[PDB]
Each structure stands twice: as structure tokens, then as C-alpha cells.
DNA sequence: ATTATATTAATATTATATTTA
């Protein structure tokens, strides 16, 4: 179980593609309406970490939460028929099953999952809780509409021989999504989030943009990862100014940004040397 | 329902695309695929790539018209729109992305009318 | 029946030819467009316990109707007869009760002006 | 709606093409195919190939005018535009590609006016 | 099934023509609005690879995804009436059909396809996932408008004299589209992407610009292909700096670029010799 | 149907006239803006080949695509009322009509045409696909403005004196347009491009600059034609270096070029003798 | 517990000499 507080400043961008796209709006990434800054949900990073763990582990005591056919009720029923089948008086039986799943699953240990379906077994508050990403420069939506020379269903097929199904494939030129996140210790002591799991989560956050790739997302990479390791479980200084110390603004006289040569990540670690640490894993 | 003194880049860009589409439609009634069926897909995002070919094809579309005074009126309203368009931007903001289509359909409605465009042209 | 008449006139929505939905929609069938799937998961404090009281007494409709109809409209990805009429009734009652200022009351047919 | 001190290459290039088209139109009202119906298709991309013949045909177009002072005013505004044009580039950028048409229609609107070009020429 | 990670740096240009045209813009190639760099989608390279396979194979167990006369629903129904017609309990039946299609099709094995139409059979995540190309020097659009001395339809535009239908045929003078792409191993082990299929895909990527040609695209060629072969399935170093090591900038005092004699492909393989390899197939 | 790959290096110049002139620019030939090299589209060579076939054939099974008085919709409707009028189920009916037109037309068999108007009948990918020509030495535009002593329409200049209508007639002093082109085999097997059609196309490419002449184009001739005949349908070596082996640069200490006595066509067939052939038809 | 499915509008902006020891 970990005992220190970690305030990591995850920074990641996108070369050309659709990172965290919005089902609410067709196929465009989440962008700020009033300004234009791109937004990326934390569930995308969580799924990238899960895929990295699935491809760089394959062992027990670190379940990865299977895809599609993985019914949550079936997994809950399978985890219930272990040490606390019935002889535990429902109440503490749920807590025992939750502890067993935390010791067995890695997704529920690092983040969390819903285990209150049919056979209830409590819920996990979760230690590490990432936030929604947000860029600084107002990004623009390119919208790269592409075509296909093969129809899907015969009903929507044309009355001729030219069977085409176009559509749109949105893309993004740039946008350093300044992600945020905080890690607690009280819930980590209950879920069993040890330091080895924390190091594995850091390695996943660092090297998830090298394997989890597709045609819609294109090419994505992680810039830097400045973790603010504390000293105790108390609160020294508000995290607002702590995360504001690593500001990311524009460089010289430029309108937009295209790569890392147009951003100036101002890192001035001067007032955060009281009872806090600093490490660089991605940058 | 059209604001010609909004001083918005998206408004004038949409109005310009609308009058371009109107000119292309007036050039030939039996038109299958107009510019809106291909040029509008990236007009509000990459205007500097589509509006160049648009202005290149505009004089030929005006010469294709059977009436020469109609082309004169269309160029006059084109320039009255582009008065507030000090420059063609690289990419439009979300608000400007919406104002593009706003001005487009506003200018299309203002053009497809009985006595309106000619009435505004007479006071010039 | 003045409260019922006002509630159903505020619930009067556009209907096409040979429509399965009647001119006046039943209240459980109207709430079924706001529940999860079957008319049983509604909130028994602000939905099936307060909407009936607000309709049978010509009271003010709560914002819970707005939010539930919005969630089920952008969730089911379609607006069938039931959710739009409820929102029209809410807007009309909020205009009539001062809970809505800049907008105005809606009519049965399509409002080609509105300017909203 | 025209910026004469923008110091942009596309702006002055478009203004020059616009005044050239205005001169060709003033040379003869019964003109069928102007320069814009052929020269504008590659004016913003290959200006060094079209503007050469444009400057070659400019003096004959000015001499074709019935009024000699009009040609003087047109040459004066041509040079006032080309003041900021230090050189004819090989190919214009996308931003410059849009600024070409921007300045073109801006100068066309400024020219097709009652008292504007002559008023600016009087203060010189 | 492959076991190594490949980070190839595909480099290809265009002599004179329209390579990857139209994000719905008429007939112009995808270019950066803020700057001017040309962009090429990965689906063009995928279709070129498919055409190369169709012209250099003609055998079973390597389906090429037919052109216009190929309804996806019909192909899915034909692949369903094989070994798992109905006696497989829907759930695992979809996975069995997906595995059969991966063992039979080459496009779904290397990249992927949509198999969730009428008779659903799951979906393929895809191992090899190319990205959108992007040039370095801001290219310019030539726009070579050409004519035709023969009208198409009998509309009112067909004059009594010269029945002409002009239009525009856009062209590009140069632009080394610095393409990118990553290859995974976890999905390759499920789809059956063996090393022979990987070698065939490399040969296709190398020799696709010699057969797949047309009048609109003109003449296109592939410069170099520097594949970064890893050693395991884990993540050694971020791929951002790995792809940044092979930078392509301008040469001496020149404004634009016309051929290979104006570019200086700086290849300094110095820090990538830890646990990675390097090979040259196209360059 | 042909089975070998042909990479011909077409070389042709212009004595005095306007070869491939640009409608986008008045009446000047397509030239490179950044440098000054003249460019010639492939449609001009295709039309010259069509005219040569029209003047050296006059027979069936080799349609030449008629000139101004040839509506494409009328020709498509005439070709539809043959063997597949309606009893063919639209889908394969389009393919049958396309095959019939390929066996009947020569332009669609060698190059291609649009057959997707009203009565759709598919489209032809086309085997032989020429590219846009490009010279080496930066050519200069002469612009030979000439006059006329006879007015055309009753405009504003036909007053009292000599009714004159001048204008410009652009000319070019020299410029060996180094044309390029590739021939495939997969599409040739479907379109029926036999070896006799290939020989006819070679003869047309050789002897098209002797009949297709006019006053605007002046005098044009074809220098050499080095066809790179392969051995199979696969890809041996990239065509970039193959076409770069026949370089054309300047001779001795000269500024420009006027005729063939100022160019030095360096032909060093040394490394192309692996699995490829070489023939000379024009040079 | 659907509906529906055929074309608006189109005739000319502008147009009179910088500077010359």
C-alpha cells in the first residue's frame, strides 16, 4: 500500500487523427464551445493503460477486465464462488468479496468498477482518479472526409454498380491536452494499491501511446509527466497553484502550434521544494 | 433576416459561398453536382484552399450567365459582402464555424427573393 | 376539469394522419418516454408522485420534467410523441407562471417565426 | 473596406489584378471574355507568368480608353498598390492565396464607386 | 504470429498529380491550412497495398476485399455458412467467425474491416495501424485546369458548337509526405499476423507506387522505409523521439524543393542501438 | 492480354509553338513557377494517339471516341442496347457492358473513360496510365503576339478604320519534356489489352507528332522512347532509380538549349539487365 | 407505435492628367 500523495501533470498531444471523440456529436473530438480547446476524457487513458497491462502481463492477481463478451454479472458470480460463498452474513460478505476482487483485479485496484449488479459486493472508491484533459491553444477541427469503394448492406447500395459509402473521418492537427490527476492514500490502503502497482501504472501512462493505436486516432504521443510526490497523507498546499506552476503557453510571435517546437513548457520548480518531490518519467 | 454590418469573418465567408453557389446554379439550371456538393465540406475549415478556386471559377460562371447585368449585380453584392472580409483566415473558430453556415443560408434566402437584391443594388 | 383541460391543451402537440398516438396521451404512457425502459423506474417523489399533482391541479411543472425528457431524447436518439408535448406543456406553464421571461408560449402547429 | 498599408504580397497582387480587370472592362463595354475569365485561373499560383503579359497589355488597354486622365489615375493607383509589392513571387502560400482574392475583390469594390478613387488621387 | 514491434518511417513523395485528394474540397489534396504541408491519408496506402496483393497473389487464405462488385453483407453471409453455421451459441460463434475471416482475409488480418452488419461476427482491432502522412516543406497547389472536346450529358449546357466540358485537374509539384505507423503484437497474435504476412506487407509498401498509378495521381514514388524492429512486446522508449531521430528538413539556401537533390534526410542511428534494430527496404 | 510490365521513358520537345497550353492562364504553356521547367499533360498525348488511331484504322472493335459530335450518354445508350439490354440483373450487367465496351473501344481499353452517366455500366481502372511531362532546363516564354486584319463580332473596336483583332499567340523555343508512364497487367487482363493493342499504342506514341499538328502548337517531335520491359507481374526494383538511370542534363558550357545538339542524353544501361529488357522505338 | 416523395431566380457596379531646374 502506498503512503505518499502524487499529483502528476500528464501532458499528451495528437499528430493527426481523432483522439477522444464524442458520440454526442457524430465523430468529432470533444472541444470547448466558447473557446476552442480540445478535451479528452480520462476513460481513454484508462483503457489505454488497461490494454498496455493486457499486452504486458498475462498473469493472475492482476485482472485486466476483458472486452466485449466479458459480462460483468458473470465475472461477479465467478468471483463470488470463492472463499465467501454464503458463510459470511451478506454485510461483511460484500466487503470480503470487494477486497478479494481488489487483490485479484488491477483495474478496480487502480481505478474502479461497478460491482453492485445482481450479487452485490460493495463498491470501490478508487485511489487514483484521473480527470478530463484540456488543451491551451484553441484547436481547430479539420474534418477529413474520406470515401469507400465498397457498400456495406445491399439495401443502401446504389441502383447501379458504383457501390460507395463515404462519410467523414475527423482529424486534429495539434493540441497538447494538459491532463490532470490526483492519487489518494486512504482508499489505496483499503484496495491494496502497493508501490509496485503504482510503478506499473506510471509505466503504462508513459508507454500507452506507443501500442494502443488505430486509424481514427492516428498518431498520439505523451509529452511529459511531472509527478508531485508528497511526504505525508495531509494537505500542504492547494493543488491549484501546484498545477499552475507548470504552465504551458505560446512561444514567440505565432498564431497556432504544430509540434513541440512551438510550445514553451515553463517549468520553474522553486516554491514546490518545501515538503514535496519531483520526478520526470515521460519528459 | 440578414446582417450585412456584423463585421464577422464567418458571416461574410458564408455569404460569399452562398452567392458563389447561387451564381453556379444560375449558370445552368440542369446542374447535377454543384460546388456545395463538394466545396462546402471544407469551406468553413480550410477557406483559403477552396475560395481560391472559387474566385478562379467565378468569372467563368459570370460569363456563362445569359444576362450580363445579372453578373454585374452578383459581383456588386459579392464585393459588398467582402467589404467586411479583411483577410481569408486559415481556420475558423467554432463560433465562426457556425457563423459560416448562418451567413451562408441568410445570403441564400436574401438572394432567392423577388425584389431585394436589385433593390439594394439600385441604392449604390 | 379546468386543470385537466389546461394540462392537455398545453400537451397538445402536432399529429400526422393515421397516427397511433391519440390526441390526448395517457399520463403513464407519457411518463414511459421518460423512464429507463418500462414505466416503473420513474422517481416516486418528483415524477409519478408530483407530475400527476401538478397536472391535476394546474400547478407549475418541475424542471425534473425538462431534465428527464432531455436525457431520454438525446439517449433514445429520437423524440416520439410524449416527450416533446411534455416540454411544450412545461414551457407554456412556466410562461403562464412567470418562470420564463424572454421566451413565449408555444402553439399547437409549427411556429415559423418564434425568433428564438 | 480596403487596407492599403497591409504590406501583404497577396493583397497587393489581388489589387493589381483587380485594377487590371477594371481597366480592361473600361477599355470596351462590349467585352465577352475578360482577363478574369482566363488569367485569374492561375494568377494566385503562377503570378510571374500571367502578370508579365498583364503588364505588357496594360499600356495598350490604357491607350484604348477614351479619356487620358482616367488612364493616368489608373496607373497612379496601380503604382500606389505595387508600392508594397517588392517582388513578384513564384507561388503564393495558402494564406497568400486567400489574400489574393481578398485584395482583388476589395480593390474592385473600391474602384466601382462614385467619389473615392479620384478623391484619393487628388491627395497626391 | 509476429512477436516484435515495428516502427516504420514511411517516406514518399509525388512528382506531378493529385495524390490523396479531397477532404470534401472539390479535387485538391489535403493540405495544412495554417501552414501549407500536404497530408495523405493512410487509406490510400492501404488500397495501394490491397491492389498490389490482388495483382501479385491470386490464391486462397489471403482474400483481397473485392472492389465495387463486393457487398460486405454478402461476403459476411458467405463466410458465415462455413464451420459455424448455427451450432456455436452466438457469443463464441462471432469470435469463431472472426478468427476464420482473419485466417482467410488478408486486409482484415493486416488492417481491419467492419463485420458487424446483419449477421454480426465481432470486430478486429487490427495489428498494423498506419497514420496520416504529413510533409515538412509547405507545398503549393498548382491547379492544372484542363479541358475536354466532348460533352457528357445532353443537358442545356451542351452548346450547338464545341461540346466542351472543362473542369480542373489539380497537381502537386513536390512534397515528401513523412508517413508514420506502428505495429502491435497482442492483436497480431489473435488475428494470426505471421511473419510471412509482415514480409508481404513490407514488399507491398515498398512496391505499391510502381503499379497503382492513374492520370489524377500522376507519378508517385516511395523514398525510404526505416523500420524500427524492437526486441520484446514491452515499451523501451517513447516513439516520439524515435521518429524524431530521422528528421527531414531543407538542404542549403533554397526556398522550396523539387526532387531528392534538395532534401537532406538526416539519419543518425546513434541512440537507437539499445534494444532495437534498423533495416532499409525502400531507401 | 499482355503479361509484362513496361516503363517507357517518353522524350519529346517543341520547336516553336504552344504545346500543352493552360486555360488557367490565358494561352501560355504549363511551366514550373518556382523554377521554369515546362510541363505537358498526358491528355495531349492521349488525344494525339486517338487522332493517329482515327486516321490509321477506320474499323470496328477499336472505337476512337468521336470528337465534338459525340454525346457520351448517347454512346452509352447505344452500347447498352446490345447483348445485355435488361436480362442481366443490373449488378453483373454493368460489368458485362464494361467488358463489351472494352472489347469494342480502344480509348477505354488503353486508357479509360467515364461510363457512369445515366445508364451506369461501371468504370475502367485502365492499364496504361501516362503521367504529366516535365522538362529539365528552365524554359522561357516567348509570347509572339500577332494581329489580324479582320474583326470577328460587332464589338466596340470595329469602328471606321482597319477592323483589327490582335491578341497573343504564345511560343516556346525549346524544352525536352521528359515524360513518364507505367503499364500494368492486372487491369490489362480485365480490359483485354492484348499485345497487338500495345504495339499499336507504341506506334501511335512514336508517330503522333507527325500528323497531329496545328498553328498554335507549331512543330513538335518525339526524341526517344526507351521502354523498360519487365519479366513478370511482380516488383523487382523501384521505378524511381529505373527512370533516373536515363538522365538528361546540359552538355558543355552553354546557358540554354536550342536543338538536339545541345543535350546529352546519358543512357548507361548497366544495372537494369537483371530481369528487365530494353528497346528503342523513337530514338 | 406512421407520416413524406418533385425547382426559389436571374438584365450593367464604374469611367477625366501624378510630375518635370
Handedness of CA A28, A29, A32, A37 (dihedral sign): negative
> What span, in angstroms and rounded, lies between the C-alpha atoms of B98 and F95?
44
D chain contacts of residue F156, beta-carbon cutoff 8 Å: 28-30
b/e string for F77-95 if b means 16 or more Cβ within 10 A? eebbeeebeeeeeebebbb
| E in contact with F (at least 3 C-beta pairs within 8 A) | yes
D–F CB contacts, 8 A cutoff, strictly below: 53
> What span, in angstroms and rounded, lies between the C-alpha atoms of D89 and D45?
9
> What span, in angstroms and rounded, lies between the C-alpha atoms of D41 and F265?
35
Please provide the size of chain B in residues. Answer: 124
Query: Smallest CA–C1' separation from D31: which nucleotide?
Result: G12
The SS3 assignment for A214 reads: strand
Q: Rounded to 5 degrees, what are φ and ψ at E44?
A: -65, -45
> What span, in angstroms and rounded, lies between the C-alpha atoms of E23 and E28?
8
The SS3 assignment for D47 reads: helix
DSSP F169-188: B---S---EE--EEE-SHHH
The Cβ-side half-sphere exposure at A172, using a 13 Å CA radius, reads 32
User: Does F240 sit within 8 Å of E151, measured CB to CB?
Assistant: no
CA B77 to chain centre: 9
Q: Rounded to 5 degrees, what are φ and ψ at F222?
A: -100, 125
| Residues 81-100, chain C, CB closer than 7 Å to nucleic strand G | 81
> What span, in angstroms and rounded, lies between the C-alpha atoms of A170 and A165?
16
Number of Cβ within a 10 Å radius of residue E97: 22
> What span, in angstroms and rounded, lies between the C-alpha atoms of C47 and C68?
9
Number of Cβ within a 10 Å radius of residue E202: 18
Query: Which helix (H) or strand (E) covers residue E87, if one does?
Result: none
Task: Report residue D15 as a C-alpha cell.
Answer: 489589387
Q: CB of F39 within 8 Å of any CB in chain D?
A: no
> What span, in angstroms and rounded, lies between the C-alpha atoms of A144 and A169?
5
Number of Cβ within a 10 Å radius of residue A187: 17
Beta strand extents in D1-124 (DSSP E only) = none
Residues 6+ apart with CB under 8 A from E255: D90, F34
CA geometry: angle at C114 spanning C113 and C116, to 5°? Answer: 130
What is each CA distance from A6 to A40, A50, A130, A282, B3, in whole angstroms? Answer: 21, 20, 11, 15, 54
Number of Cβ within a 10 Å radius of residue C14: 13
> What span, in angstroms and rounded, lies between the C-alpha atoms of D29 and F93?
55
Distance D77 CA to G20 C1' (A): 20
**What single DSSP character describes residue F217?**
T
E chain contacts of residue B30, beta-carbon cutoff 8 Å: 153, 155-157
**What single DSSP character describes residue F24?**
G
> What span, in angstroms and rounded, lies between the C-alpha atoms of A196 and A150?
49
The residue with cell 470534401 is E24
User: Does A256 sit within 8 Å of B90, measured CB to CB?
Assistant: yes
Which residue out of B40, B87, B94 would a mutagenesis test of the A interface target, given it has the greatest number of A Cβ atoms within 10 Å? B94
E chain contacts of residue D91, beta-carbon cutoff 8 Å: 140, 256
User: Does B56 sit within 8 Å of D98, measured CB to CB?
Assistant: no
The Cβ-side half-sphere exposure at A200, using a 13 Å CA radius, reads 22
Residues 6+ apart with CB under 8 A from D110: D1, D2, D116, D117
User: Does D32 sit within 8 Å of F34, measured CB to CB?
Assistant: no
Q: What is the 3-state secondary structure (H, E, C) of F60-110?
A: CCCECCCCCCCCHHHHHHHHHCCCCCCCCCCHHHHHHHHHHHHHHECHHHH
Task: Report residue A129 as a C-alpha cell.
Answer: 482518479
Q: Is the CB of B31 under 7 A from strand G?
A: no
**What single DSSP character describes residue F23?**
G
> What span, in angstroms and rounded, lies between the C-alpha atoms of C86 and C7?
9
Query: Which helix (H) or strand (E) covers residue E9, if one does?
Result: strand E9-16
Task: Report residue F11 as a C-alpha cell.
Answer: 522524350
Residues 6+ apart with CB under 8 A from F270: none
Task: Report residue A160 as a C-alpha cell.
Answer: 447501379
Angle, helices B9-27 vs B47-64, to 10°: value is 40
What is each CA distance from B22 to B29, B58, B116, in whole angstroms? Answer: 11, 11, 15
Q: Are E206 and F63 in contact (CB under 8 A)?
A: no
F chain contacts of residue A161, beta-carbon cutoff 8 Å: 90-91, 94-95, 120-122
Pick the residue from chain B with its C-alpha nearest to D1.
B83
D chain contacts of residue E256, beta-carbon cutoff 8 Å: 90-91
Pick the residue from chain A with its C-alpha nearest to F122.
A161
D chain contacts of residue F143, beta-carbon cutoff 8 Å: 52-53, 56
> What span, in angstroms and rounded, lies between the C-alpha atoms of A4 and A6?
7
> What span, in angstroms and rounded, lies between the C-alpha atoms of A58 and A54?
6
> What span, in angstroms and rounded, lies between the C-alpha atoms of D20 and C114?
49
Distance E62 CA to G20 C1' (A): 85
Instruction: Choose the closest CB to D37 out of B52, B60, B78.
Output: B60
Number of Cβ within a 10 Å radius of residue E87: 7
User: Does D30 sit within 8 Å of F25, measured CB to CB?
Assistant: no
Rounded to the nearest 10 degrees, how much is the dihedral formed by the CA atoms of C45, C46, C48, C54?
120
Q: Are A245 and A198 in contact (CB under 8 A)?
A: no
In whole angstroms, how large is the CA radius of gyration of chain C? 14
> What span, in angstroms and rounded, lies between the C-alpha atoms of E127 and E3?
11
User: Does B41 sit within 8 Å of A140, measured CB to CB?
Assistant: no
Q: Are E182 and E229 in contact (CB under 8 A)?
A: no
The residue with cell 470577328 is F152
**What single DSSP character describes residue F215?**
T
Residues 6+ apart with CB under 8 A from A162: E68, F116, F120, F122, F123
Q: Rounded to 5 degrees, what are φ and ψ at A225?
A: -145, 95
> What span, in angstroms and rounded, lies between the C-alpha atoms of D117 and D76?
10
Q: Is the CB of D118 under 7 A from strand G?
A: yes
Distance B50 CA to G7 C1' (A): 27
> What span, in angstroms and rounded, lies between the C-alpha atoms of A243 and A239?
6
> What span, in angstroms and rounded, lies between the C-alpha atoms of A145 and B42?
9
Q: What is the helix, strand, coil percentage profile of chain D, to 5? A: 65, 0, 35
Query: Which helix (H) or strand (E) covers residue F13, if one does?
Result: strand F9-16
> What span, in angstroms and rounded, lies between the C-alpha atoms of B60 and D35?
10
Handedness of CA F76, F82, F85, F90 (dihedral sign): negative
> What span, in angstroms and rounded, lies between the C-alpha atoms of F25 and E143?
11
Task: Report residue F37 as a C-alpha cell.
Answer: 521547367
Task: Report residue E106 as a C-alpha cell.
Answer: 488478408
Partnered with residue A16 across adjacent β-strands are A219
Please provide the size of chain C in residues. Answer: 116
> What span, in angstroms and rounded, lies between the C-alpha atoms of F193 and F187?
8
| D in contact with C (at least 3 C-beta pairs within 8 A) | no
| A in contact with B (at least 3 C-beta pairs within 8 A) | yes
The Cβ-side half-sphere exposure at D47, using a 13 Å CA radius, reads 22
What is each CA distance from E60 to A54, D46, D116, F232, in whole angstroms? Answer: 33, 52, 76, 21
> What span, in angstroms and rounded, lies between the C-alpha atoms of E42 and E23?
13
Query: Smallest Cα–Cα separation from E264: which of E224, E208, E235?
Result: E224
Partnered with residue F63 across adjacent β-strands are F105
| Strand G bases, protein C-beta under 7 A | 1-4, 7-19
Query: Smallest Cα–Cα separation from A265: which of A211, A225, A221?
Result: A225
D–E CB contacts, 8 A cutoff, strictly below: 23
> What span, in angstroms and rounded, lies between the C-alpha atoms of F8 and F107?
19
> What span, in angstroms and rounded, lies between the C-alpha atoms of E217 and E229?
32
Residues 6+ apart with CB under 8 A from D24: D31, D34, D35, D57, D61
Instruction: Choose the closest CB to B53 out of E33, E143, E155.
Output: E143
Q: What is the 3-state secondary structure (H, E, C) of chain B?
A: CCCCCCCCHHHHHHHHHHHHHHHHHHHCCCCCCCCCCCCHHHCCCCHHHHHHHHHHHHHHHHHHCCCHHHHHHHHHHHHHHHCCCCCCCCCCCHHHHHHHHHHHHHHHHHHCCCCCHHHHHHCC
> What span, in angstroms and rounded, lies between the C-alpha atoms of A145 and C1?
57
> What span, in angstroms and rounded, lies between the C-alpha atoms of F136 and C111?
68
Task: Report residue C42 as a C-alpha cell.
Answer: 420513474
Task: Report residue B21 as a C-alpha cell.
Answer: 453557389
Number of Cβ within a 10 Å radius of residue D97: 26
Q: CB of A283 within 8 Å of any CB in chain B?
A: no
Instruction: Choose the closest CB to B45 out of A36, A138, A140.
Output: A140
Query: Smallest Cα–Cα separation from A83: which of A64, A66, A104, A62?
Result: A104
Handedness of CA A99, A101, A105, A111 (dihedral sign): negative
Helices (H) and strands (E) in chain E, counts: 7, 11
Strand pairing class (F133-134; F128-130): unpaired
Q: Rounded to 5 degrees, what are φ and ψ at A278?
A: -155, 135
Q: Are A119 and A7 in contact (CB under 8 A)?
A: no
Query: Smallest Cα–Cα separation from C52: which of C38, C41, C65?
Result: C65
Number of Cβ within a 10 Å radius of residue A25: 11
> What span, in angstroms and rounded, lies between the C-alpha atoms of E191 and E98?
8
User: Does D90 sit within 8 Å of E143, measured CB to CB?
Assistant: no
> What span, in angstroms and rounded, lies between the C-alpha atoms of F102 and F61?
9
Q: Is the CB of C18 under 7 A from strand G?
A: yes
What is each CA distance from A239 to A178, A232, D10, in whole angstroms? Answer: 15, 15, 49
> What span, in angstroms and rounded, lies between the C-alpha atoms of B67 and F134?
41
User: Does D31 sit within 8 Å of F26, measured CB to CB?
Assistant: no
Handedness of CA C17, C22, C24, C27 (dihedral sign): negative
Query: Smallest CA–C1' separation from D113: which nucleotide?
Result: G14
The SS3 assignment for A263 reads: strand
Please provide the size of chain F in residues. Answer: 283
Task: Report residue B106 as a C-alpha cell.
Answer: 441568410
Q: Spell out where chain A is interrupted, by the residue before each break (C to N > 2.5 A).
A: none
Number of Cβ within a 10 Å radius of residue A260: 16
Burial class of F192 by CB neighbour count within 10 A (0 to 12, 13 to 18, 19+): middle
Q: CB of E26 within 8 Å of any CB in chain B?
A: yes
User: Method of determination?
Assistant: cryo-EM
Q: CB of A31 within 8 Å of any CB in chain B?
A: yes
Residues 6+ apart with CB under 8 A from F137: F37, F174, F175, F176, F250, F256, F257
The SS3 assignment for F239 reads: helix
The SS3 assignment for C5 reads: helix
Burial class of E154 by CB neighbour count within 10 A (0 to 12, 13 to 18, 19+): middle
Q: Is the CB of D112 under 7 A from strand G?
A: yes
DSSP C8-53: HHHT-----TT-SS-SS--HHHHHTTTSSSSTTSS-TTTTTTTHHH
Chain E neighbours among A 94-133 (CB < 8 Å)?
Answer: none
Please provide the size of chain D in residues. Answer: 124
Q: CB of E155 within 8 Å of any CB in chain B?
A: yes
Q: For residue E84, is it left (φ>0), alpha (ψ between -120 and 50) or beta?
A: beta
The residue with cell 516504420 is E8
User: Does B94 sit within 8 Å of A31, measured CB to CB?
Assistant: yes
Resolution expressed in Å: 3.3
Handedness of CA A48, A53, A58, A60 (dihedral sign): negative
Q: Spell out where chain B is interrupted, by the residue before each break (C to N > 2.5 A).
A: none
Q: CB of A263 within 8 Å of any CB in chain E?
A: no
**Alpha helices for E165-224 (secondary structure H):** 186-191, 195-206
The residue with cell 502506498 is A2
Please provide the size of chain E in residues. Answer: 283
Number of Cβ within a 10 Å radius of residue F148: 12
Q: Is the CB of B112 under 7 A from strand G?
A: yes
Q: Are B16 and B82 in contact (CB under 8 A)?
A: yes
b/e string for B58-68 if b means 16 or more Cβ within 10 A? bbbbbbbbeee
Angle, helices D68-82 vs D9-27, to 10°: value is 170
Q: What is the 3-state secondary structure (H, E, C) of F133-166?
A: EECCCCCCCCCECCCCCCCCCCCCCCCCCCCCCC
Q: Are D97 and D45 in contact (CB under 8 A)?
A: yes
**What single DSSP character describes residue E186?**
H
Partnered with residue A13 across adjacent β-strands are A221
Pick the residue from chain D with its C-alpha nearest to F21.
D38
The SS3 assignment for D38 reads: coil
Q: Is the CB of D120 under 7 A from strand G?
A: no
Distance D66 CA to G17 C1' (A): 13
The Cα diameter of chain B in Å comes to 39
List the single protein residue with the shortest CA to C1' distance from G9: B112
Helices (H) and strands (E) in chain D, counts: 5, 0
Number of Cβ within a 10 Å radius of residue A268: 9
Q: How far apart are the first and last CA of chain E?
A: 27
Distance D30 CA to G9 C1' (A): 25
What is each CA distance from E247 to E176, E240, E269, in whole angstroms? Answer: 12, 12, 11
Angle, helices A195-206 vs A42-55, to 10°: value is 110
> What span, in angstroms and rounded, lies between the C-alpha atoms of D18 and D6?
17
Q: CB of A66 within 8 Å of any CB in chain E?
A: no
The residue with cell 470595329 is F158
The residue with cell 485528394 is E21
Amino acid at each position: 500500500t502506498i503512503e505518499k500523495r502524487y499529483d502528476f501533470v500528464f501532458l499528451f498531444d495528437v499528430q493527426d487523427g481523432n483522439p477522444n471523440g464524442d458520440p454526442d456529436a457524430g465523430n468529432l473530438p470533444r472541444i470547448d464551445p466558447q473557446t476552442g480547446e480540445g478535451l479528452v476524457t480520462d476513460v481513454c487513458l484508462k483503457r489505454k493503460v488497461r490494454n498496455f497491462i493486457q499486452m504486458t502481463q498475462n498473469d493472475e492477481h492482476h485482472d485486466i477486465f476483458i472486452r466485449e463478451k466479458g459480462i460483468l454479472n458473470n465475472l461477479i458470480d465467478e468471483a463470488h464462488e470463492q472463499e465467501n460463498v454464503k458463510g459470511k452474513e451478506k454485510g461483511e460478505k460484500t466487503e470480503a468479496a470487494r477486497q478479494y476482487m481488489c487483490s485479484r483485479y488491477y483495474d478496480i485496484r487502480t481505478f474502479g468498477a461497478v460491482m453492485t449488479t445482481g450479487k452485490n459486493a460493495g463498491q470501490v472508491r478508487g485511489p487514483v482518479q484521473l480527470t478530463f484533459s484540456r488543451s491551451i491553444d484553441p484547436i481547430m477541427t479539420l474534418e477529413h472526409s474520406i470515401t469507400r469503394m465498397a457498400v456495406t448492406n445491399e439495401k443502401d447500395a446504389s441502383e447501379t454498380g458504383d457501390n460507395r459509402t463515404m462519410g467523414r473521418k475527423f482529424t486534429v492537427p495539434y493540441g497538447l491536452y494538459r491532463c490532470h490527476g490526483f492519487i489518494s492514500t486512504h482508499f489505496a490502503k483499503q484496495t491494496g494499491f502497493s508501490e509496485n502497482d503504482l510503478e506499473l501504472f506510471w509505466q503504462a501512462l508513459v508507454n500507452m501511446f506507443d501500442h494502443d493505436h488505430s486509424a481514427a486516432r492516428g498518431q498520439m504521443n505523451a509529452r511529459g509527466l511531472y509527478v508531485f510526490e508528497h511526504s505525508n497523507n495531509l494537505g500542504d498546499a492547494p493543488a491549484d497553484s501546484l498545477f499552475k506552476r507548470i504552465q504551458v503557453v505560446k512561444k514567440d510571435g505565432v498564431e497556432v502550434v504544430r509540434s513541440f517546437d512551438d510550445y514553451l513548457v515553463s517549468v520553474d520548480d522553486k516554491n514546490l521544494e518545501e515538503t514535496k518531490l519531483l520526478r520526470k518519467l515521460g519528459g | 433576416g440578414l446582417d450585412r454590418n456584423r463585421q464577422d469573418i464567418g458571416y461574410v465567408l458564408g455569404r460569399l459561398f452562398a452567392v458563389l453557389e447561387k451564381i453556379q446554379a444560375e449558370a445552368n439550371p440542369g446542374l447535377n453536382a454543384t460546388i456545395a456538393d463538394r466545396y462546402f465540406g471544407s469551406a468553413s475549415s480550410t477557406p483559403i484552399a477552396v475560395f481560391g478556386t472559387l474566385m478562379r471559377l467565378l468569372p467563368h460562371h459570370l460569363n456563362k450567365l445569359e444576362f450580363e447585368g445579372r453578373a454585374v449585380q452578383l459581383q456588386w453584392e459579392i464585393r459588398q459582402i467582402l467589404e467586411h472580409c479583411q483577410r481569408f483566415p486559415n481556420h475558423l473558430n467554432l463560433e465562426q464555424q457556425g457563423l459560416f453556415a448562418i451567413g451562408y443560408y441568410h445570403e441564400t434566402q436574401f438572394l432567392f427573393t423577388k425584389d431585394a437584391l436589385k433593390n439594394l443594388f439600385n441604392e449604390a | 376539469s379546468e386543470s385537466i383541460a389546461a394540462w392537455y391543451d398545453d400537451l397538445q402537440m402536432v399529429r400526422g394522419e393515421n397516427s397511433p398516438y391519440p390526441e390526448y396521451m395517457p399520463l403513464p404512457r407519457l411518463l414511459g418516454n421518460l423512464v429507463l425502459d418500462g414505466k416503473m423506474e420513474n422517481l416516486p417523489s418528483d415524477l409519478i408522485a408530483q407530475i400527476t399533482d401538478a397536472a391535476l391541479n394546474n400547478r407549475v411543472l418541475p424542471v425534473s420534467l425538462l431534465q428527464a425528457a432531455l436525457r431520454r431524447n438525446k439517449a433514445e436518439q429520437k423524440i416520439t410523441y410524449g416527450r416533446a408535448s411534455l416540454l411544450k406543456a412545461y414551457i407554456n406553464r412556466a410562461i403562464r407562471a412567470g418562470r420564463l421571461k424572454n421566451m413565449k408560449e408555444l402553439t399547437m402547429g409549427l411556429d415559423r417565426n418564434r425568433q428564438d
